[PDB]
Design a protein around this ligand. Structure first.
Ligand SMILES: [K+]
Ligand SMILES: [K+]
Ligand SMILES: [K+]
Ligand SMILES: [K+]
Ligand SMILES: [K+]
Ligand SMILES: [K+]
Ligand SMILES: [K+]
Ligand SMILES: [K+]
Ligand SMILES: [K+]
Ligand SMILES: [K+]
Ligand SMILES: [K+]
Ligand SMILES: [K+]
Ligand SMILES: [K+]
Ligand SMILES: [Mg+2]
Ligand SMILES: [Mg+2]
Ligand SMILES: [Mg+2]
Ligand SMILES: [Mg+2]
Ligand SMILES: [Mg+2]
Ligand SMILES: [Mg+2]
Ligand SMILES: [Mg+2]
Ligand SMILES: [Mg+2]
Ligand SMILES: [Mg+2]
Ligand SMILES: [Mg+2]
Ligand SMILES: [Mg+2]
Ligand SMILES: [Mg+2]
Ligand SMILES: [Mg+2]
Ligand SMILES: [Mg+2]
Ligand SMILES: [Mg+2]
Ligand SMILES: [Mg+2]
Ligand SMILES: [Mg+2]
Ligand SMILES: [Mg+2]
Ligand SMILES: [Mg+2]
Ligand SMILES: [Mg+2]
Ligand SMILES: [Mg+2]
Ligand SMILES: [Mg+2]
Ligand SMILES: [Mg+2]
Ligand SMILES: [Mg+2]
Ligand SMILES: [Mg+2]
Ligand SMILES: [Mg+2]
Ligand SMILES: [Mg+2]
Ligand SMILES: [Mg+2]
Ligand SMILES: [Mg+2]
Ligand SMILES: [Mg+2]
Ligand SMILES: [Mg+2]
Ligand SMILES: [Mg+2]
Ligand SMILES: [Mg+2]
Ligand SMILES: [Mg+2]
Ligand SMILES: [Mg+2]
Ligand SMILES: [Mg+2]
Ligand SMILES: [Mg+2]
Ligand SMILES: [Mg+2]
Ligand SMILES: [Mg+2]
Ligand SMILES: [Mg+2]
Ligand SMILES: [Mg+2]
Ligand SMILES: [Mg+2]
Ligand SMILES: [Mg+2]
Ligand SMILES: [Mg+2]
Ligand SMILES: [Mg+2]
Ligand SMILES: [Mg+2]
Lengths: 206, 146, 64, 118
RNA sequence: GGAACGAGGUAGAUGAAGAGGUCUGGAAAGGCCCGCCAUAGGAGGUAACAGCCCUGUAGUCAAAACUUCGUUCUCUCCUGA
RNA sequence: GACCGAUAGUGAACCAGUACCGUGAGGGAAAGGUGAAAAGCACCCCGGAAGGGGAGUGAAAGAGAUCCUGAAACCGUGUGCCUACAAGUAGUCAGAGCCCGUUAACGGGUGAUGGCGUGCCUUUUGUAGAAUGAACCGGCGAGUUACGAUCUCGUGCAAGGUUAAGCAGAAGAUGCGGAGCCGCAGCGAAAGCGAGUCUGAAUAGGGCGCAAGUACGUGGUCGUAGACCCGAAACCAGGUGA
RNA sequence: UAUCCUUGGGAGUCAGACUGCGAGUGAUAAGAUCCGUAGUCGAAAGGGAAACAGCCCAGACCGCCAGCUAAGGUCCCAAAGU
RNA sequence: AACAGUGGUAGGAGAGCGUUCUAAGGGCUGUGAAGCCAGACCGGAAGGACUGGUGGAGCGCUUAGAAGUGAGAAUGCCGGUA
């Protein structure tokens, strides 16, 4: 669909036409949900462990004879009902990652991109060239574009000055065109793409 | 979508059943295992196909046959699949594999005679059924053994 | 790990087009003096695994 | 993540103990016996809400019988006579009159006697 | 076996911006109203929760000595159809 | 770090492989928290001291040394109602009297007396059971995870569906990667033939076929793993002891 | 009258008890034992049979200080006929 | 709306309550967080508030996610105390 093409300063320099196959689809809310869960699951480190009765120190001998003492029968001081005993089940190191079908991955990214167009949270820029890598300048540009809350800045190639300038601002992430992902798109309110980046995204997705 | 208003597809996710969490659940105490016996025990139950010492089914019945070491299985292609191609196309095994009419080649391509063919094709294949070779030739084509 | 096929069963049974198990008959080894020709003709042919048995053994041939 | 037992256990058990206030000795103090007694109290309360309706009807009949016999009728004949007269005043109300307004009760008893003496 | 050159390791150095006002308070890092820095909004500390108080952080520097890696020369060795 | 937070997490947050136990090999604990700062209570008083009451410090001392919080069992002091003719699974429903006054409700406490009423759990044909288990209170304490299988549901794509290792990339998403896997064709022991095929001498008859899957997710169940938790007597290996 | 069948997922059960009726075993004993048949218990509280799983009556979603009945009852305990 | 139904062990099925952690959003809190104590409040249940006291720094709520997710019994284990 058609959107306003801005500059760094915040003046409108005509209207770019986005690819309707990428930016104009009906968002599939079920695949977006699946894509978010999957991505959040993939971030999990899963480094958790407990000692079962075998792994707890000691506990080899039978605490006391089977019969005659008047006590409950016990096999080990580290049996799970004992204080200081092994855990039954409990966490073990594991991955939480899984892969959705590639077509579902594509539909998820197109859905959230096309959702940003519907919500009018897509700011297509002519270019984003910070001369000096300065955070004050990046902050001024974002005020210039009325970007109050969070924002994902999307450059075509790895822009050093933009990446450095935005690094320290809370809630402002910078990615290349290839580094766009569902979770980053959905988590940031505004999506600031350059014209070069939009072309690079449309190359892959369409 | 919003991260603060996520919702799964209806019927995509159920709550897991947790046994042995009190009587109200209906799987309290015995955890749905009933009372006593081998099936209620931890690690319990007999191995698959065990009939409590009655001679098992598999063991009552005879072994049959052998596996041929040199068995050829062909990637079969019915006539209805060949209708996808336009007239004048030399339908080779490489073309069928590249277009994805067949997924794997195996011993080779056999053309079989289910469905209709209404395309003049130079079908090149390892094998043909009698009816397939007829149907290719009948509609102007050339069945070629390769 | 991967579930192991019951190899004894894989040598006796075979899956049909609609997912039934084809089987041979028992009583087809010896002692043919003690069986009628009618019995022998019928035991020669193949049969299906019954519903009750199929429930018991289906997973043992899952990989086939 | 680990879930400690935490506060849920104390909260649940304490509510049972507050329901057991006034019970004797350990039955208001200790969770296990308080729990049993609160449960038993439930069975009894359910049963007795039913028995209450039996016990009050029994009480009203006794009082109607006493008042009837002051008017020279048994309860059996009074109720027969009231049924024949088509008086549909229930036993609660008849027993209320028997205590509170015996002259009104006597009129109803006279109405019953009129039907019986037919 | 030696030298030279480069990049690391084993100590460190430098390092932007608010005691802003006011309100509660034992104390302000908190509230309210205002600034400012940011290649630094990692973190820990500080009388309650601190980018701007301290130790720091980003960035940029630094080694007498021992040590690791690389490179070049030296050095050493050597006909293959 | 969708790991633990002092019965957890290492056996060990603390002078722990210590103390303690054992001839020895060997077994193997318990035990964290004053305060922002010691400003760690000068001085007076009772007491031999301990301990306390003032005073002072502090935001707080009912933060004063196993000194943050401080549950329950358990032990006490005070007293509103009841209680010395009563037969009690201890309540419940009915109910005066007396004493109160609330999250203000056809309220709260107590309970003379009346009716009814043999705890809970387990295990059983059947248990108030003179079967089992629990002194009480607190904490801890049991269907899990991985990889396969299968079914239901969901989603994507659909006669197709899907990549694995790996490479690049935050330990990420994702891109690339089609090797491989399942399905679209079956029948037959097999050669093989193929909408059929096998049996058979047979155009016969009969068997099995003909006339939506797949990738991923949640859930149910199954397999292999200790596989819901606790429990033997024993077996074997290497040591330690006259 | 509203069940029934088929396919697939998940079970539990394989100690039963008494009562009536029909039989065996026994001694035409057993609260015995073993079948058949129906019920109840099991897994069913309520009313009756003093008390009393299995008998008689009857199936408790919850509330009521309404009413009619069942078995069983109506002198007093104890509701209703001296 | 009408009509009918709603005892239940093993067991199947469904709908929910609460706990810790995470994400996102939105809040509370030294003008007093969690915890603890008390109450005559609210919901069909699991449970949830409100008020006051103690406490002295953290914690809800919404939606989704993940589980060391719920104890009264194991002659259970440890502690305390009868
Ligand atoms: K079950
Ligand atoms: K320990
Ligand atoms: K008292
Ligand atoms: K009583
Ligand atoms: K005994
Ligand atoms: K046929
Ligand atoms: K599908
Ligand atoms: K599954
Ligand atoms: K299992
Ligand atoms: K019988
Ligand atoms: K409080
Ligand atoms: K558990
Ligand atoms: K116990
Ligand atoms: Mg061991
Ligand atoms: Mg442990
Ligand atoms: Mg059940
Ligand atoms: Mg239980
Ligand atoms: Mg049991
Ligand atoms: Mg049994
Ligand atoms: Mg069983
Ligand atoms: Mg033979
Ligand atoms: Mg924790
Ligand atoms: Mg607990
Ligand atoms: Mg009644
Ligand atoms: Mg400095
Ligand atoms: Mg100031
Ligand atoms: Mg504080
Ligand atoms: Mg603690
Ligand atoms: Mg420890
Ligand atoms: Mg010694
Ligand atoms: Mg205090
Ligand atoms: Mg403190
Ligand atoms: Mg304390
Ligand atoms: Mg007296
Ligand atoms: Mg007397
Ligand atoms: Mg017995
Ligand atoms: Mg006794
Ligand atoms: Mg026993
Ligand atoms: Mg005992
Ligand atoms: Mg206990
Ligand atoms: Mg031996
Ligand atoms: Mg020796
Ligand atoms: Mg010696
Ligand atoms: Mg029987
Ligand atoms: Mg008997
Ligand atoms: Mg019969
Ligand atoms: Mg039973
Ligand atoms: Mg029944
Ligand atoms: Mg009865
Ligand atoms: Mg009775
Ligand atoms: Mg019973
Ligand atoms: Mg009547
Ligand atoms: Mg009477
Ligand atoms: Mg029911
Ligand atoms: Mg009913
Ligand atoms: Mg279930
Ligand atoms: Mg907490
Ligand atoms: Mg409060
Ligand atoms: Mg648990």
């Amino acid at each position: 669909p058609k959107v306003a093409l801005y500059n760094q300063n915040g003046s409108t320099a005509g209207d770019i036409e986005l690819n309707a196959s990428v930016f104009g689809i009906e968002p599939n809310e079920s695949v977006v949900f699946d894509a978010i869960l999957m991505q959040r699951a993939s971030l999990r480190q899963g480094t958790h462990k407990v000692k079962n009765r075998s792994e707890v120190r000691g506990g080899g001998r039978k605490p006391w004879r089977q019969k005659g003492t008047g006590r409950a029968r016990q096999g080990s001081i580290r049996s799970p009902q004992w204080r200081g005993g092994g855990v039954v089940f409990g966490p073990t190191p594991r991955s939480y990652s899984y892969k959705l079908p590639k077509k579902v991955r594509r539909l998820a990214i197109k859905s959230v991109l096309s959702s940003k167009v519907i919500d009018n949270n897509i700011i297509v820029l002519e270019d984003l060239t910070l001369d000096t890598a300065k955070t004050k300048e990046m902050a001024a540009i974002l005020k210039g574009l009325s970007v109050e809350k969070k924002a994902l800045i999307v450059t075509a190639d790895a822009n050093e000055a933009v990446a450095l300038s935005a690094r320290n601002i809370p809630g402002v992430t910078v990615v290349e065109a290839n580094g766009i992902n569902v979770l980053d798109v959905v988590n940031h309110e505004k999506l600031l793409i350059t014209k070069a980046a939009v072309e690079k995204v449309e190359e892959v997705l369409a | 979508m919003k991260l603060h208003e996520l919702k799964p597809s209806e019927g995509s996710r159920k709550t897991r059943n947790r046994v042995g969490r009190g009587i109200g659940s209906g799987n309290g105490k015995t955890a749905g295992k009933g009372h006593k016996g081998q099936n209620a025990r931890s690690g319990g139950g007999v191995r698959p196909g065990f009939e409590g010492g009655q001679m098992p089914l598999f063991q009552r019945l005879p072994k049959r046959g052998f596996t041929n070491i040199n068995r050829k299985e062909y990637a079969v292609v019915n006539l209805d699949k060949l209708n996808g191609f336009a007239e004048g196309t030399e339908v080779t095994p490489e073309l069928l594999l590249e277009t994805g009419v067949i997924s794997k080649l195996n011993a080779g391509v056999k053309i079989l005679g289910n469905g209709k063919l209404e395309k003049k094709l130079t079908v090149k294949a390892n094998k043909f059924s009698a009816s397939a070779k007829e149907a290719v030739e009948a509609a102007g084509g050339t069945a070629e053994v390769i | 790990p991967k579930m192991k096929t019951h190899r004894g069963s894989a040598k006796r049974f075979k899956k049909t087009g609609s997912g039934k198990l084809k089987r041979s008959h028992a009583y087809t080894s010896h002692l043919f003096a003690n069986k009628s020709q009618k019995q022998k003709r019928k035991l020669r042919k193949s049969a299906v695994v019954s519903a009750g048995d199929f429930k018991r053994i289906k997973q043992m041939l899952a990989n086939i | 993540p680990r879930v400690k037992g935490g506060t849920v256990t104390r909260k649940r058990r304490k509510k049972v103990l507050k329901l057991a206030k006034g019970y004797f000795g350990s039955k208001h103090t200790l969770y296990k016996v308080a729990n049993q007694q609160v449960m038993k109290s439930g069975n009894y309360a359910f049963r007795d809400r039913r028995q209450k309706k039996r016990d009050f009807r029994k009480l009203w009949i006794t009082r109607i019988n006493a008042a009837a016999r002051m008017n020279g009728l048994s309860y059996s004949r009074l109720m027969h006579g009231l049924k024949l007269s088509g008086i549909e005043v229930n036993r609660k109300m008849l027993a209320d009159l028997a205590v509170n307004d015996l002259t009104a009760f006597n009129q109803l008893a006279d109405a019953a006697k009129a039907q019986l003496n037919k």
